Subunit: 280 residues, 3 copies
């Protein structure tokens, strides 16, 4: 190998997060008061890392942080039921852990935290977090296995009801790369409907990393994937590999989803910054 | 290895089954007259076993047994079309077979019956079994490969329209285990709608067994899975592994499905029987 | 091995295709003027082959050819946006390429074009091709890896809205084989709804080829698969393996989809041509 790969994990990391009501009426998470986004910021860790998240709810309603895939004790579940949500103006420290795979005492193989995951609110609107998630309380989490290939850049695409990342229909979002960049996509689905994500000009492996380790992986290679509420997946592509520069559409392939909005552009540039067939 | 594993199969097994109308108006299967359940009882066999099911329809309407995945001749298809359904008060012997994987004469690999499957009616209401399935005529079937890890216990969760196992919304069902128990879940979906099954605090492999054989399996590890009508899957988890005791929610992650019902508790206890943050 | 396998690819192939309005009001593709079908004809190539498609639009509206999975430059995307659609009476040469898998300079593994793919219009009705696809502008593409097992025959099944291959409900289509034939199914979904495809009496591997290479592939073996708009998959079965001759139903397992239409027969014959329990 010669590409950047993830190191072995096992550090204790500390992080501040905030839930905020935004001027537009949405609700979002951020690492800093006043810099909440929808989607929320990317959290990336190595298998074995522990994360202590000092979470503050600056809203006038109860809110939580619930994560998928990672190890948390019931005190960090982030639900009303376990009293692990947070009162208005409150602060709580959530802890997320991750583990490497390995042999159990009984000889079986324990899986490993690595994968494409996400966090979201589990209490706003309803005690399953319907209002919070609808308003924008969700974000991606990546957990890397030692040896995993690292990308040049990560972009997050979220199908939340009939929006991409809670934006008005036909407003992208658009992402840019240069031919040959190693680009990582985290795809999260929220809300009420099933979707199909499609990319023109590229393809990936339907497995944990979205890439093939080598010629023995029998995983389907696809350009199209059905996702439902709270699914998360990811993959890496080489931008323009075998196909060259261009404004490569990605869309919710459900044909009315694409007709009313839910289309974005993966703008893949030559070194000079131009894109054949696309007028800036 | 040190955990219980499935032995080699090849026994001929005999079983009585009944379709019954229940006092509540539902229809269910059972091994004994008067002990029908919804879901129907678990059938578990080893690859290579043959099963002769002496099926009796005690209802006033035609009924059948149709199974997925296992080997049956067209005479055991369980449909009106092949005249393999059963008249009211009638009896029919269905035969299901299973085979081990192996090399064909041409050098190719023949798959193997092993997996998480299910049986259901294929004729009540309509000749596709819409009324029967809606009323409760469905149940799980497990076929084990020699060497497969055996669980401490198996629980069946069925998303049938907007019910879990045909129960009234918000009535679970709830399942119990102790920290460290090897728990098996069979998840079957029936009816009209697509669903996402989600478990808090646990994860499994999106492959045949729901577990990783070791570090070369590239299967996605998930905590969330889209299922549609007549899908079946299963997996095993170590209860509370890396996360400890607690009332761990499972729910149809479609956010209106969770709001009106379709939530249950995986109650994971310490040895003393207590569950932190949960009041009995 | 002893069964026919795909050779190494790398030929340049030339093909004429037409989009035509049909007498019934549908729109279809064909290799010859007057022989358009719905679905469109099968294109099959070997990894490394290049295809130059001389496409002519004989309709009174703009049309295109867009393919999934294969390598194309943005000039063959087949969309209004890149001006790669085709005016009424126009002709355009689309080029599709395919590549073998292999090691990149950086040591990573590049996937490979092989798989079950499809082509469709991307501009009729809307600039996402809603009218074209609805009317019948879609067809299957197969790309084979060197060494892939070759079938005796390939059949294409398309769930397009609430039709199979744009046929009136309950009109099949029906497919025939003899016990022991190696049959290939290409399953494509189009339109607005999610579906489940189910086959009685047979099963396949949820991976690239739909078959297991041997005993180390941990892929789920299934008889049921959720598909959404623009999904494509395929697999091979041995007709009647372990189950014998019969009229083996396949259907959209969504129970109202099966009630109103969306059921077909895989007619598996003994050498004498008879099918037990089926009256011609
Ligand atoms: Co939840
Ligand atoms: Co969740
Ligand atoms: Co059926
Ligand atoms: Co069925
Ligand atoms: Co498209
Ligand atoms: Co497409």
């Amino acid at each position: 190998i010669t590409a950047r790969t993830a190191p072995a994990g096992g550090e204790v990391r500390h992080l501040k997060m905030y839930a905020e009501k935004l001027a537009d009426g949405q609700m979002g998470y951020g690492f800093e008061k006043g810099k909440a986004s929808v989607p929320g910021p990317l959290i990336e860790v190595n298998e074995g890392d522990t994360l202590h998240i000092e979470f503050t709810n600056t809203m006038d309603v109860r809110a939580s942080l619930h994560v998928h895939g990672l190890d948390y004790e019931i005190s960090s579940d982030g639900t009303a039921m376990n009293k692990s949500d947070v009162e208005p103006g409150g602060t709580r420290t959530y802890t997320w852990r991750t583990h490497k795979p390995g042999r159990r005492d009984d000889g079986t193989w324990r899986p490993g935290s690595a994968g494409y995951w996400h966090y979201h609110d589990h209490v706003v609107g309803t005690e399953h977090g319907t209002g919070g998630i609808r308003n924008g309380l969700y974000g991606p989490v990546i957990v890397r296995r030692k040896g995993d290939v690292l990308p040049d850049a990560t972009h997050t695409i979220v199908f939340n009801d009939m929006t991409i990342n809670n934006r008005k229909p036909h407003t992208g979002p658009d992402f840019e790369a240069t031919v040959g960049d190693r680009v990582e996509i985290v795809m999260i689905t929220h809300g009420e409907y099933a979707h199909t994500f499609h990319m023109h000009g590229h393809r990936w492996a339907d497995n944990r990393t979205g890439i093939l380790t080598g010629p023995d992986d029998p995983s389907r290679v696809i350009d199209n994937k059905i996702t439902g509420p709270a699914d998360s997946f990811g993959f890496q592509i080489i931008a323009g590999e075998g196909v060259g520069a261009g404004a490569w559409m990605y869309h919710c392939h459900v044909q009315s989803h694409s007709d009313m909005g839910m289309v974005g552009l993966f703008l893949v540039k030559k070194p000079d910054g131009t894109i054949p067939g696309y007028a800036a």
